[PDB]
Amino acid sequence: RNMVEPMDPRTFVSNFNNRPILSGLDTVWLCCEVKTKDPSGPPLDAKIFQGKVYPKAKYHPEMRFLRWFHKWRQLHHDQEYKVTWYVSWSPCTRCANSVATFLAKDPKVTLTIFVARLYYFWKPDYQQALRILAEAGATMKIMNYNEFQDCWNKFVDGRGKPFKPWNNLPKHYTLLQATLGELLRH
Amino acid sequence: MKPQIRNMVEPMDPRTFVSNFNNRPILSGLDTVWLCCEVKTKDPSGPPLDAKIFQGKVYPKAKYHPEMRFLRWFHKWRQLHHDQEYKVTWYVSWSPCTRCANSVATFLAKDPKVTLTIFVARLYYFWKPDYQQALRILAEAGATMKIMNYNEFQDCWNKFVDGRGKPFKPWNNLPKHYTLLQATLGELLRH
Ligand SMILES: [Zn+2]
Ligand SMILES: [Zn+2]
């Protein structure tokens, strides 16, 4: 969390709003944190990537993370690392495949993904994207209050001010988390 | 020239139906509940048998909640008709409160020749442990709980709405709402 260029409060509030059916958000935001196996250890690095939802998947923020992280692994000690993502939309199939491929070649990396909104949760291809990541060993969880607050504290230019939840935040969470759980069943 | 459910009921206004069965998962200012029931024999393709529309409010007292009106009506209906197995289906606009759930459960325990399927358009206060528990109380009594999807909304339209020949018109995101609600119901019934 220390020394990213933080995102501004308005960008966060707009892009991490967890209304389940939401139009006019063409942007994906990905905040990531790298740590060692140790939960008593500090963050080693942190990045914020933005990208568009449109199908030049090469520029989806998940793909930018993989490119960044690949280099980061080389330049650091070969050891087990815990990566956490907070992502405003869940990933597309292409990105899931690349992450899956990545996680297969790199078992010293374990990935936890927190998602504000499921992208196209009614469409089978984005449903499969979630299942692809699960099988590759990534956990996926819908963001609830604590994760939004964590993401606010770590990645947003909140200037000491506390996270303020928007209306129906936990209600949206209940719907989305049930839907994620359903999509990952069996 | 054949018998129809719509000839057995006093149909609701299409404006009443669109408003009350809109399946937006988080909806405020909708204090009314509509319950459409149909009674069938063991045969789902059998001729239309009986049907009734009940209305009420979500506020107490529970005694005039449509589910309680149904139970009184149906207790009487069962006496005025031949004894055999019956299957009841409800299309209900909000899911039931705990007091209604407990009363339906006791009814179902005492009349095991009756089974009940409840399709609900929306889960009422699904974030409140009391209304979550109502759902589990009904499931435990053997009621089949499902969320209304397109086919059920259409069937409800055909049978219980004053549509004047006109076809059921889906509102925006009906199937997306369905997915969210059906996952949430499944989760509340399992956990
Ligand atoms: Zn992607
Ligand atoms: Zn009730």
Residue numbers in the entry:
A (entry chain F): 6 to 138, 143 to 195
B (entry chain A): 1 to 138, 143 to 195
Sentences copied from the publication:
APOBEC3s (A3s) are deoxycytidine deaminases that have important roles in mammalian innate immune responses.
We obtained two crystal forms of the rA3G-CD1 protein under different crystallization conditions, and determined the structures to 2 Å (CD1-1) in one crystal form and 2.9 Å (CD1-2) in the other crystal form, each in different space groups and with different crystal packing interactions. The 2 Å crystal structure of rA3G-CD1 indicates that the core structures of both the non-catalytic CD1 and the catalytic domains of A3s are highly conserved, including the Zn-centre conformation, the core β-strands, the N-terminal end of α2 and the orientations of α2–α4. In the crystal structure of rA3G-CD1, Y125, K128 and D130 are in close proximity, forming a compact charged interface around residue 128.
